[PDB]
């Protein structure tokens, strides 16, 4: 289609409305209620443009550019006097009841309403009467609520209900007394409530964690990074001020995490700002604790390493690719051990084998929203990989989108989309040990142990293609449900199969792979998705190594007299007693970490590593996409005593000092080239982000905005002489505003969104080729592997039916979004949010034990008689005990294990 704006001819996409058709070309129209992902509702009436149907038309009509399709031959005027006066009047009407709260507002300089008040040129107030006020609700530890600043643009209710699926936020009130919130006070229990701080154009829903230690947007030092709290790897923009991480903002990735994060990744950053964190290298002689800087620590570590017969290294799925590779090259290829256990590594290797060898195209997170029928086997997505659950909700609403598009309704008429599709939605079949958070839209939910879920998957795979291995012994009711799932999946056009290593079983992944292979054999565009546990689980599995049991038995047998533990707590993947014995037995433990782990008492040397905010690196998400996360700040700028370096830098300098007795602090590009040289299958991480020599017309990229303040006074308490700003030799960014952050620069890594006249999170519209689509000049991060030409065979080893053995209790994993991450539970803001540790029991088994809810049951696992209060789970199957993974003293390695001595105490 071809449109005419003010006499200028523009080629646009005719399936789009006029608002983002003009926003794609760079034409500024004020707007509040429209969002690129939600749709158009025509509420705020701010997007008015004067439309003409002929080339010679004087009057025209003031039409809504978010509600008028951009067909071929529309002559719209934006800067006309009538349209500008009406837009100014709408801004004025929104400004009649707005409070005088801008200095004391958390979105000052980040406000969409401020940008559209200055954009329309409204600065004179002739309203003289009183302003309406509203009370505020306590929405929990995350969201600060201030309803006086609202403009009734209906974005919060639209996102939270029609997009996030939440049920506790709604619109109440009257004519002008419109309220947006809960029917009472209490925590917003949705797992995607954190995006309300950027969906809301005003300062109603604000980040309370940021509001504790608050600084303005221009005071933030930003960086592009990857969220480390689970395996999805959503792109984030960490921003710091005064040496502590202040706020995690959303970063636009058109393929992964376009406009929405989750609460664990958005509010779980509080572990970085802990004072218990090691900031200097600390060495122990017996009970004496001394502090060294980098050089003497490196020389002493190299001396003790040379005085040992075999140095072993225990990596972690939390650390980056470069740091794990540095440990591997420091300790040797054969002596490198992955920090995960044997079962977790087996499930991870199977998931990687299905991904990069199964011949089935695994889709990205943006591509999930277009799949028709979704089968989730084993994985509790909403509490582990929550963004995949949100994309699953979008793919479910795709059916109503399809019926709406069949009735000649444009895609941006979202109200008509839910109008036509009242309750009809795509099939979703979830399996878990209990009820999930996806049960509101799921076509079926199977509450069963992992053996029965795996057998259900094998039954689906056999009933699709008869060459698949059959399971015998299914009840006819479950057989009818199997037939229903088969009819739903076979009749679809883009089936999706979602599994992962969080189910605690291998046969679940085998069954999901067999279902995907059977769907592929019938001639369908089937996709698969394995959700891993940690952020860099996939990269550690790709690199490989031994299990934690092998490292512990090397330490216990005496063949390893020196162990380097890289960013691992070692109690999350093994028992605490065995780890403590194997570490006290070893005469040298060197823990390189940025967190005060429990094993640092046994550590002979502690090396203060850097977290994601203070280190550069590459992480591989759950779909094989290599992504580079950059440094936000130099920790030594404010606290000059702080010797806190990148873990790969620590290990590479230790390797160099061990070899040639010289200390050589390397660069990130050298380590990246070493990875892509020694490991052929990690060669794609060179293309994840360009090197430190990349310039936009000769200059670097700025980490802080052009109006960064207090350069000559933020360090004046220590010394009045402002030092040289830190130099980033590793990456292409600089710790200064002398850099390029234009929206039209030929780059993919964007630290923050800012345009002249666009200060809100809506400033991301200028950084894309089309608004709501991919990022301009391509999205960052590349896939490590392609789809194979041929796939795997049928996994024949079906499991047996779950028969509850007396005495032994199978442990059913109950993952929580707030508490199952190793680092997110260390945040002090999650302690007021995470639930209490409850052991979950069937009513029948609790009645057999005689225990009621509330009382304490003690259970012993490897000499640890730990007591937990009891919650009753009706959906849990008999013979199991429900345990929360990742909590205090309950490791995720407990999944699938037995539990003897379960008595009331």
């Amino acid at each position: 289609a071809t449109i005419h704006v003010d006499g200028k001819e523009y080629e646009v996409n005719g399936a789009d409305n006029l608002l983002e058709a003009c926003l794609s070309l760079g034409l500024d129209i004020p707007y509040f209620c429209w969002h690129p992902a939600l749709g158009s509702v025509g509420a705020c009436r701010q997007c008015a443009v004067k439309q003409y149907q002929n080339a010679e038309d004087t009057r025209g009509r003031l039409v809504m550019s978010c509600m008028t399709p951009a067909s071929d031959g529309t002559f719209i005027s934006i800067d006309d006097e009538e349209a500008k006066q009406f837009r100014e009047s709408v801004v004025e009407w929104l400004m009649t009841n707005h409070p005088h709260d801008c200095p004391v507002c958390e979105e000052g300089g980040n406000c969409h309403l401020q940008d559209m008040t200055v954009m329309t040129g409204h600065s004179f107030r002739r309203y003289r009467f009183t302003k309406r006020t509203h009370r505020n609700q306590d929405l929990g530890p995350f969201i600060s609520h201030e309803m006086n600043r609202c403009i009734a643009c209906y974005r919060c209710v639209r996102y939270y209900k029609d997009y996030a699926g939440g049920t506790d936020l709604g619109v109440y009130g009257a004519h002008d007394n419109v309220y947006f919130g809960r029917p009472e006070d209490g925590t917003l229990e949705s797992e995607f409530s954190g995006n309300l701080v950027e969906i809301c154009p005003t300062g109603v829903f604000t980040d309370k964690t940021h509001s504790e230690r608050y600084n303005r947007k221009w005071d933030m030092q930003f960086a592009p990074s990857i969220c480390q709290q689970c395996s999805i790897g959503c792109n984030i923009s960490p921003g710091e001020r005064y040496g502590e991480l202040r706020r995690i903002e959303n970063r636009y990735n058109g393929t992964v995490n376009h406009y929405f994060l989750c609460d664990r990744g958005r509010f779980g950053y509080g572990y970085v700002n802990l004072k218990d964190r090691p900031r200097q290298p600390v060495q122990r002689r017996g009970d004496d604790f001394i502090t060294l800087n980098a050089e003497q620590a490196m020389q002493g570590a190299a001396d003790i390493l040379r005085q040992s017969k075999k140095v072993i290294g225990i990596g972690s799925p939390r650390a980056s690719v470069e740091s794990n590779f540095a440990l591997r090259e420091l300790v040797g290829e054969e002596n490198f051990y992955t920090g995960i256990a044997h079962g977790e590594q087996e499930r991870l290797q199977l998931a990687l084998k299905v991904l990069r060898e199964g011949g089935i195209y695994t889709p990205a997170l943006r591509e999930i929203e277009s799949y028709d029928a979704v089968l989730v086997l084993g994985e509790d997505v909403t509490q582990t990989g929550a963004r995949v659950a949100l994309a699953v909700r979008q793919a479910v609403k795709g059916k109503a989108r399809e019926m709406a598009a069949a009735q000649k309704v444009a895609d941006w008429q979202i109200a008509a989309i839910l109008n036509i599709g009242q309750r009809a939605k795509h099939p979703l079949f979830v399996t878990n040990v209990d009820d999930t958070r996806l049960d509101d839209i799921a076509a079926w939910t199977y509450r069963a142990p992992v053996e029965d879920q795996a057998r259900l998957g094998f039954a689906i795979a056999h009933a699709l293609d008869n060459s698949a291995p059959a399971v015998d012994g299914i009840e006819p009711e479950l057989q009818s449900k199997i037939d229903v799932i088969v009819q739903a999946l076979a009749g679809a056009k883009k089936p999706l199969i979602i599994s992962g290593t969080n189910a605690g079983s291998l046969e679940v992944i085998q069954a999901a792979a067999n279902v995907a292979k059977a769907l592929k054999g019938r001639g369908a565009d089937v996709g698969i998705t394995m959700i891993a546990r940690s952020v860099n689980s996939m990269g550690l599995g790709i690199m490989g190594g031994g299990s934690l049991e092998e490292a512990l038995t090397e330490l216990e047998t005496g063949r390893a007299d020196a162990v380097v533990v890289l960013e691992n707590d070692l109690h999350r993947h093994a028992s605490a007693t065995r780890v403590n014995a194997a570490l006290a037995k070893a005469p040298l433990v060197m823990v390189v970490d940025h967190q005060r782990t429990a094993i640092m008492e046994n550590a002979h040397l502690v090396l203060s590593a850097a977290s994601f905010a203070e280190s550069d690196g590459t992480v591989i998400n759950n779909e094989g996409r290599a992504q580079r996360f950059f440094q936000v700040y130099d920790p030594a700028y404010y606290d000059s005593k702080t010797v806190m370096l990148e873990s790969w830098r620590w290990l590479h300098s230790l390797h160099s000092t061990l070899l040639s007795r010289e200390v050589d602090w390397t660069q990130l590009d050298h380590v990246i080239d070493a990875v892509v040289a020694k490991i052929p299958e990690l060669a794609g991480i060179k293309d994840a982000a360009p090197d430190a020599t990349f310039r936009i017309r000769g200059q670097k990229l700025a980490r802080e905005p052009h109006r960064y303040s207090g350069r000559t006074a933020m360090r004046a308490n220590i010394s009045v002489h402002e030092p040289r700003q830190p130099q980033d030799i590793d990456t292409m960014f600089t710790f200064s505003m002398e850099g390029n952050n234009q929206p039209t620069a030929h780059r993919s890594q964007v630290p923050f969104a800012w345009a002249p006249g666009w200060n809100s999170p809506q400033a991301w519209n200028k950084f894309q080729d089309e608004v709501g689509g991919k990022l301009r000049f391509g999205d960052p991060g590349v896939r490590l592997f392609e789809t194979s030409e041929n796939g795997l065979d049928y996994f024949t080893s079906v499991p047996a039916r779950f028969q509850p053995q007396d005495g032994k209790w199978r442990i059913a994993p109950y993952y929580h979004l707030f508490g199952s991450d190793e680092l997110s539970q260390r945040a002090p803001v999650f302690q007021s949010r995470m639930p209490q540790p409850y052991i979950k029991l069937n009513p029948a088994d609790a009645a057999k034990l005689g225990v009621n809810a509330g009382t304490r049951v003690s259970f012993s696992y490897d000499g640890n008689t730990v007591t937990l209060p009891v919650e009753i789970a009706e959906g849990l199957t008999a013979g199991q005990v429900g345990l929360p993974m990742g909590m205090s003293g309950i490791a995720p390695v407990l999944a699938g294990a037995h539990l003897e001595d379960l008595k009331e105490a």
Partner: protein, 145 residues
């Protein structure tokens, strides 16, 4: 829209009343006598039209109470210079096509009709001069001319 005595000899059709700047509607006419002040009558109409708004879209929701407050000031005689022009621009910007539905054009039809026919009653409610700001001690105010 309100009509006058000269419009009384007009046929009660859609097109005939629509030609003379009004609407047929439900054809259930209301008679307004000379004892009834039109400013207070339009004030009551606007109170009804602003308290019964659905609250979805901006111009009706956040501009009808402004007209209600302006007519409250005019009814008490506390009108300020610039209120009738504000009401006229409010009628202009709450016409068909501006708002999401047709409640607000029907709300502003009697207001613009009473402005057109009975402007001398609306001008009689302005007694006090315009004063939006107050004198802040220590800052000289800006005086536009």
């Amino acid at each position: 829209d309100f009509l006058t005595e000269a419009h009384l000899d007009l046929p009660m059709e859609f097109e005939s009343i629509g030609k003379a700047g009004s609407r047929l509607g439900t054809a259930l006419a209301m008679a307004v006598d000379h004892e009834i002040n039109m400013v207070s009558l339009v004030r009551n109409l606007e109170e009804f039209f602003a308290r019964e708004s659905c609250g979805w879209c901006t111009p009706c929701r956040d501009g009808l109470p402004w007209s209600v407050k302006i007519l409250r000031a005019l009814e008490r005689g506390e009108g300020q210079p610039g209120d009738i022009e504000t009401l006229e621009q409010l009628c202009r910007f709450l016409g068909p096509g501006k708002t999401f539905c047709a409640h607000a054009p029907g709300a502003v039809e009697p207001l613009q009709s009473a402005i057109k026919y009975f402007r001398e009653e609306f001008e009689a409610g302005i007694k006090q001069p315009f004063s939006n700001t107050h004198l802040i001690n220590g800052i000289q105010p800006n005086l536009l001319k």
